[PDB]
Design a protein around this nucleic acid. Structure first.
Lengths: 78, 92, 93, 89, 93, 78, 103, 88
DNA sequence: TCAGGGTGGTATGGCCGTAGGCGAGCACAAGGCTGACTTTTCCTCCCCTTGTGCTGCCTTCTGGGGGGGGCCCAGCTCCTCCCCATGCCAGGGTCTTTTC
DNA sequence: GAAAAGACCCTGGCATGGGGAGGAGCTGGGCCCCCCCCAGAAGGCAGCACAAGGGGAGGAAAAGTCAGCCTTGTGCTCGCCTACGGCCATACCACCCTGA
């Protein structure tokens, strides 16, 4: 149960970066469950590639492709 | 109450660091991947790529949520706002 | 590259096209065009990312400068609209 | 596919003082290796649309103006027709 | 003054017809395409494919505009609801 | 001039399909501008494909390609 | 021999073979790729068609029209997500209204 | 054009219900789209691992990446069943 | 370690002949749709109040970040070769077009 | 949707280069542990400003009515464009060596 490691201060810093001025008291728990499904999708599309390449180490390239296939390209990691 | 929030907005908008602590993020990632395949190793760059993707996704979501609050004549962003943004986006 | 005045490798882009299985035959003008288009786009995205660097009193280009230049535009932003630039941050808004 | 050697040359012609950090070079590798697959994925299906088997400067021109915005495609195409013209000549 | 609207919704959601007149839509298509190429010709299926998609884009945009209106505790949709829906689906920020 | 062939009844019918109960009087011009932008964007790509195939007539598939190029794949026109 | 009966299929594994090869997807194409991608599409078709036939029988009809395919696709959650960018021509929308809108 | 096989599948599942000529011009587009999808994904899967061949492993991984949930589960099961029946 | 100069060829593509389908243009009703008007009811918008949840601040205590080191399974490379996929031709079985 | 004729490639058979599966060697980088320590999180409390309810007013959609118009279903024509065919011209691929 490491989903509580996305602490309220971290979720509030991420909110302040977007421009949010005041944050409700359910925003933290509601953002945890949003990030959880986002990671659950990407860390499945990356382990798919990893298993196909008959590897056991997830690579930045597996992650970059798993991200590209969801419409979110990422520049910098290869 | 709020001017300290505007200065906070400026500080974390001018900065490019990762706002989630790296070790808790890593443990969450390795807890999520355990459901898919156990004994799965990770690179350092792979986890950093995941954390760069997620912290930009969440920051981009918190901008649509703020629009969904300015729409309802509010400043406190709420789960109602997050669901409206995530439904208009197509995710929900 | 020397014949076409291109700082991008015409031979390499030819090899990439033939090995990339785009078609079974790549013409002699295809990689010359697609090593001036990529070269021009790179020059375009470097001009603004270096102007931003001059705006932050730095002699170096960083992902912050690249994201700043890409987003603070009209056509580059439209083209690179679903791209995450690592260590880029977001525009102060 | 590293374009790091060439991205550094073109900068030396436009900004003769500014450098690129290794983190911002690894981004431009992802950029050029991205618009390369973008252009030659549109110039690829265009051939199959025409039941054709050859990718040439006619299909590269179409793919460029089919993916690049407004004044970009008006310039990206402009540079290529200034290139293939010199290559053949 | 809200019952006729509720039966109109129940009528136009059950049907699948095209709610924009074919002749003025084809005129709009022909008048737009001219700025791209003069003396252009269309098939019947080209027009019927442009319309059949333009009448799904607008319906979806309206189902998102209505959601923004309900978010703002309202029933009358306004241009700002369309603007919010478009900004959040990314069509034009 | 032909944008007003998209009459107020037509936009209101489209809105009723979209479930809109009440419509403000300024929604009509907003929807007309929106439709014009959508049409301008798709027709540009369709005519570019037509010019590439050296034809003079815009085929249905020349529009299907301009539509699947925008992530709006259209089923029913071959 | 009928390779689309050797598999138990009804889609043409031979035509899928020739489409895989003509489409320029790889310099070589295996001997099981056509058979896998003629049972994926056969199953997907058998699923959408069964759902649309059910949607048509729910409307007291005996012929599937695009309305029923759109109803089946937009009523099933998996086909919703798969076909999320698809505009099914002459399909209409799902009959649904908000609860904040009724009297 | 997959009209005859779409008819065969339809007659096999729903033998009483028919299909219109425009509900058939959607199944053709459907099959043509979900072909060009799996085939492009398997092409990427072959190219990344530096292969020249596409097989029923790159097709399976493309199915697993494209189809969601129980769709992918059942499609993978059907594909494996068909390939293991053709091979036998 | 890979792109370039030279050879040969053959297939892909360029150019003219052609004929026929479909796309554009013209009248012509004439009923369904649209536009304008009027009444009026309901919805939007503003204002007030409060009470409550959010923020700001203060202190404490933790656990993440920064190193150092061991090791041990995993991913990359090299060479063999064998088994799989391809180029090519024969013949007909199946998919394509028309009619009711 | 079923019956009937046609034409286009499906499948088998044969010869063949090559692609990847396997065994072995290697090394490297990912996990695991250890220590520190200081900045960050968590909790508690004061206080404050913001969301949500209530109310009222007015103005702008909506519903019904009526008159005009114009889309469209139909018929007819002209012609041009485009898919097919035939011939042949040369562009690029496979291959042999080398130099950057």
């Amino acid at each position: 149960d490491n989903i509580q490691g996305i602490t309220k201060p971290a979720i509030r810093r991420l909110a302040r970066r977007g421009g949010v001025k005041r944050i409700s008291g359910l925003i933290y728990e509601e953002t945890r469950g949003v990030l959880k499904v986002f990671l659950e999708n990407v860390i499945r599309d990356a382990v798919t590639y990893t298993e196909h390449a008959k590897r056991k180490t997830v690579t930045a390239m597996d992650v970059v492709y798993a991200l590209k296939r969801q419409g979110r390209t990422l520049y910098g990691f290869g | 109450p709020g001017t300290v929030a505007l200065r906070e907005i400026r500080r974390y908008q001018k900065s490019t660091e990762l706002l989630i602590r790296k070790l808790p993020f890593q443990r969450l990632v390795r807890e999520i991947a355990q459901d898919f395949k156990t004994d799965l190793r990770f690179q350092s760059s792979a986890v950093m790529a995941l954390q760069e993707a997620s912290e930009a996704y969440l920051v981009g979501l918190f901008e649509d949520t703020n629009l969904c609050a300015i729409h309802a004549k509010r400043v406190t962003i709420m789960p109602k706002d997050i669901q409206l943004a995530r439904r208009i986006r197509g995710e929900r | 590259s020397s014949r076409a005045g291109l700082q991008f490798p015409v031979g390499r882009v030819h090899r990439l096209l033939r090995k990339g299985n785009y078609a079974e035959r790549v013409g002699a003008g295809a990689p010359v065009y697609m090593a001036a288009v990529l070269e021009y786009l790179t020059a375009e995205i470097l001009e603004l990312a270096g102007n931003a660097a001059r705006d932050n009193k730095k002699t170096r280009i960083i992902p912050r400068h690249l994201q700043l230049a890409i987003r603070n535009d009209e056509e580059l932003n439209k083209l690179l609209g679903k791209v995450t630039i690592a260590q880029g941050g977001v525009l102060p808004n | 596919e590293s374009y790091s050697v060439y991205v550094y040359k073109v900068l030396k012609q436009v900004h003769p003082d500014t450098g690129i950090s290794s983190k911002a070079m690894g981004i431009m590798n992802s950029f050029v290796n991205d618009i390369f697959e973008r252009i030659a994925g549109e110039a690829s299906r265009l051939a199959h649309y025409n039941k054709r088997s050859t990718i040439t400067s006619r299909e590269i021109q179409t793919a460029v103006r089919l993916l690049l915005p407004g004044e970009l495609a008006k310039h990206a195409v402009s540079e290529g027709t200034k290139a293939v013209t010199k290559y053949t000549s």
